[PDB]
């Protein structure tokens, strides 16, 4: 019963295309279609989250004339050192009276900072992105919205017409296999695997989830000897890898990605870039087809062009006059590829004229347009 | 509010400070413990040894702070509290050990107050304070109009949170002024405090006292004394020695002014004047404040470039058939095509 029509539209946005449908035995008709939005969404699997680390140091244990023992703790990047021959002072005088064998036990460890719930970046594995598109379809004056996945195996039915979208001519994505997401920005980065990060670099402190108690850290934290009687816990530690990364992030994919892809997060997606093309197949019902003899007759038709200019816009103006004894609608299509018509169809009643804009690179412009069951020739003299 | 009793059984303390003024270190009542700068709006959360909004009688009073003074806590005016870097900072709020302030760019951070004796006390730490840029434009102040972008801030809230600092029973505090030389004897003055003492003097001269004690036939240089049996609990600062292998935890204090992601306003650079050439776009850029300019091609090779624009800069870019995308500061990106 139905007829399947196939067309291909470049993967662009905001550009209308005319689709010509001509089933044998029936009058040809033009369907107007425009691509309004294209979205590509990667599947993301979180490996870990990187955030600022907090170094936590408890009061140093000072044992007067005696040896302090060090315990092995399971805290992240735990460091412990025992120093001897120390003679610490407080504001009111020396801490110990007996200095023969004074020993100080110093400890430090690394915890997730408070900001790890607010300021953090997620390290994801990206794969098998799903492509989808939003099409505007205009048939018989009716503007409808068609949304489908551009895989070639997915379709939706709107106004009894089935729209099959895809497969895409390209499976290219702006997102690499390994990406890092921070707030509204996405970066392509070869981040280190969990359990094997590096000090001063992104991924120095890692956790699988924001609420996890399982925290990995490598800050190369080393405890140093007290400064000659000063009570404190001096140490050598690598700079936060997250802070380093934040300053060295550079431009995000929103600004660096090719094909003009717009990048957004929550969910992570690439939007409206010129990647390949999108084939479309439409199942058009028999009710949508009419014969040429079923069209209303038009008479007293003519075309004139009062003015034409050369510019990037449609500076030319072509006006087609018509008369009809009966009210009805007629399909319109150009008989040449030199000049296109913005109107897929027109409404005809009484005595009136319709205005179509056009552009050309040639000073002498000639074209013909088929209207309803007849044809009208147009010509113009164009100037700079 | 005054319903926070987490400081009810706690005290302020003295701690080491690398610079108490004139480049000389000392033990200070306002010694800094740490500086937190996770906020993106430039707000700093400063932790100090003194406690703000609390009186020595353990009553709440937002106009007063309490600081340690030779074993005893003492009151001071909160109005005398200051924070500065390269220039004076604006304090947004305080609670206990934590001060929230917005400081100007500088390499150091100083906190101090005027005590009960009208003596100024301060502590200076090195601190590379240089606030991050929110958005793609720089500014010295927030505009009345601009783009809304998210950034981290410290919330003006004293409500309990999950992050806490442990409070432990403090160590015996050495005090050389407890002992005095009386002829050939050493006298220990308690002044109501419990005092632990040890000596090299002959006889059983080790022990505790709650009353005046005299050790015979020796000199002060052969004795040591410290105040013990503390009744109020103290934060387990890294600058204060622990008296026990695993410490002696008595309670915990929540950290006030939690970090949150909030809407932050940034200025927009004035729109450029644009003219066109042959496959070229010409922009006249007249920003009031330093503005980042960046652009990419809409083809296979984006050729991404970026530069900072100061003032009155003329920029000419090549426009490919695929189109050129240009981002000007915090304004929406412009799209150009060949004419």
């Amino acid at each position, epitope marked *: 019963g139905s007829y399947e029509h196939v067309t291909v539209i470049p993967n662009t946005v905001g550009v209308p295309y005319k689709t010509l449908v001509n089933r044998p035995g029936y009058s040809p008709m033009v369907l107007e279609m425009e691509l309004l939005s294209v979205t590509l969404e990667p599947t993301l699997s979180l490996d870990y989250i990187t955030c600022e680390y907090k170094t936590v140091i408890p009061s140093p244990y000072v044992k007067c004339c005696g040896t302090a023992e060090c*315990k092995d703790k399971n805290l992240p990047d735990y460091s412990c050192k025992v120093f001897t021959g120390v003679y610490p002072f407080m504001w009111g005088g020396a801490y110990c009276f007996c200095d023969a064998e004074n020993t100080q036990l110093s400890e430090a460890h690394v915890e997730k900072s408070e900001s790890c719930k607010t300021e953090f970046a997620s390290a994801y594995r990206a794969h098998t992105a799903s492509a989808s598109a939003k099409l505007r379809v205009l048939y018989q004056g009716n503007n409808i919205t068609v949304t489908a996945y551009a895989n070639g195996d997915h379709a939706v039915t709107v106004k009894d017409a089935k729209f099959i979208v895809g497969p895409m001519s390209s499976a290219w994505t702006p997102f690499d296999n390994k990406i890092v997401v921070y707030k509204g920005d996405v970066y392509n980065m070869d981040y280190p695997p969990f359990g094997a990060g590096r000090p001063g670099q992104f991924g120095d402190i890692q956790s699988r989830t924001p609420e996890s108690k399982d925290v990995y850290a490598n800050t190369q934290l080393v405890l140093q000897r007290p400064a000659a009687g000063t009570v404190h816990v001096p140490y050598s530690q690598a700079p936060s890898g997250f802070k380093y990364w934040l300053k060295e992030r550079g431009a995000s994919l929103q600004h660096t990605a090719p094909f003009g892809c717009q990048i957004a997060t929550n969910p992570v997606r690439a939007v409206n870039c010129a990647v390949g093309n999108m084939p479309i197949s439409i199942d058009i019902p028999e009710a949508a087809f009419t014969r040429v003899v079923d069209a209303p007759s038009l008479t007293d038709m003519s075309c004139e062009v009062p003015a034409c200019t050369h510019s990037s816009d449609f500076g030319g103006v072509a006006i087609i006059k018509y008369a009809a004894s009966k009210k009805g609608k007629c399909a319109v299509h150009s008989m040449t590829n030199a000049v296109t018509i913005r109107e897929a169809e027109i409404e005809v009643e009484g005595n009136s004229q319709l205005q179509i804009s056009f552009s050309t690179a040639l000073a002498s412009a000639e074209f013909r347009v088929q209207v309803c069951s007849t044809q009208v020739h147009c010509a113009a003299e164009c100037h700079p | 509010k005054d319903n926070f009793n987490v400081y009810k059984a706690t005290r302020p303390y003295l701690a080491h400070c690398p610079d108490c003024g004139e480049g000389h270190s000392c033990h200070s009542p306002v010694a800094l413990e740490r500086i937190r700068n996770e906020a993106t709006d430039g707000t700093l959360k400063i932790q100090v040894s003194l406690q703000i909004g609390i009186k020595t009688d353990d009553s709440h009073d937002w106009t007063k702070l309490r600081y340690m003074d030779n074993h005893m806590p003492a009151d001071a005016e909160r109005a005398g509290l200051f924070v500065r870097t390269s220039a004076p900072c604006t304090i947004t709020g305080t609670m206990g050990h934590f001060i929230l302030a917005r400081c100007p760019k500088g390499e150091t951070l100083t906190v101090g107050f005027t005590d009960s004796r009208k003596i100024s006390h301060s502590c200076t730490h090195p601190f590379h304070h240089d606030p991050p840029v929110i958005g793609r434009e720089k500014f010295h102040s927030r505009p009345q109009h601009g783009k809304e972008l998210p950034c981290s801030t410290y919330v003006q809230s004293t409500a309990a949170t999950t992050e806490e600092i442990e409070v432990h029973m403090p160590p015996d505090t050495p005090d050389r002024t407890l002992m005095s030389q009386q002829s050939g004897n050493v006298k220990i003055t308690v002044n109501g405090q419990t005092v632990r003492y040890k000596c090299n003097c002959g006889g059983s001269n080790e022990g505790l006292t709650t009353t005046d004690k005299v050790i015979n036939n020796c000199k002060v240089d052969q004795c040591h004394a410290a105040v*013990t049996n503390h009744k109020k609990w103290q934060y387990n600062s890294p600058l204060v020695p622990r008296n026990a292998e695993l410490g002696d935890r008595k309670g915990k204090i929540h950290i006030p002014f939690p970090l949150a992601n909030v809407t932050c306003r940034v200025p927009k650079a004035r729109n450029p004047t644009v003219t066109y050439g042959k496959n070229q776009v010409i922009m006249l850029l007249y920003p009031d404040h330093p503005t980042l300019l960046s652009y990419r091609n809409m083809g296979e090779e984006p050729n991404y470039q970026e530069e900072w624009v100061m003032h009155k800069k003329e920029v000419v870019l090549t426009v490919p058939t695929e189109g050129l995308e240009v981002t000007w500061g915090n304004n929406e990106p412009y799209k150009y095509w060949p004419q």
Partner: antibody
Amino acid sequence: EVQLVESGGGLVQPGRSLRLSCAASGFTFDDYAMHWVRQAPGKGLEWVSGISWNSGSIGYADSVKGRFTISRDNAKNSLYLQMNSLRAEDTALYYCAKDMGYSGNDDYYGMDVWGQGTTVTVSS
Amino acid sequence: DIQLTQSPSSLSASVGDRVTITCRASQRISSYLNWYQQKPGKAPKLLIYGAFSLQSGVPSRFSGSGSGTDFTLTISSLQPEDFATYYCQQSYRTLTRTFGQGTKVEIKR
């Protein structure tokens, strides 16, 4: 939920051995030093033996030093005392107790958790 | 070799009264003394460690102190539940902890 549970004990003749054990729950076992303390009927508390975390250091009372052996199993969360050549003088109620440190060399701490001691009787 | 000595035997006092128990070493052992409380049929409970520090769950009625080499345990006001045998302990900074002989608090009549 923090508790210690003594087991073993009972009646033996002089010269025979007896093995005591103590189960721990509600706290990390290997984070603390532990001790055995015995109380004879009508008498005060007497420390018998003790062991540090990770069995780094072991001490004994002089009266049992050459006869008793103390050990711990940090996988089973349990403490053991092996008493050999038991004498009539060793009759007592034996308690296990948890210290507040990991080393036995910290003199600031006492034993915060005590179990329910098991009676050991030595008699012909 | 070194023993702790407490009050000779027992202290008789009424409810609401004040009780002080003194413990001393024949030789100096440590800077701190622990205190324990035991009731018949029950395990010893730690009240004070580090000479001055109260254990959690222990009421303010109990207070650690001392004078010279002699440490004390003070009960500011006896409750019906405070009648028990109290022990003192020192560690020598090693595993070989020692206890005093025990001081019993009896009801006054």
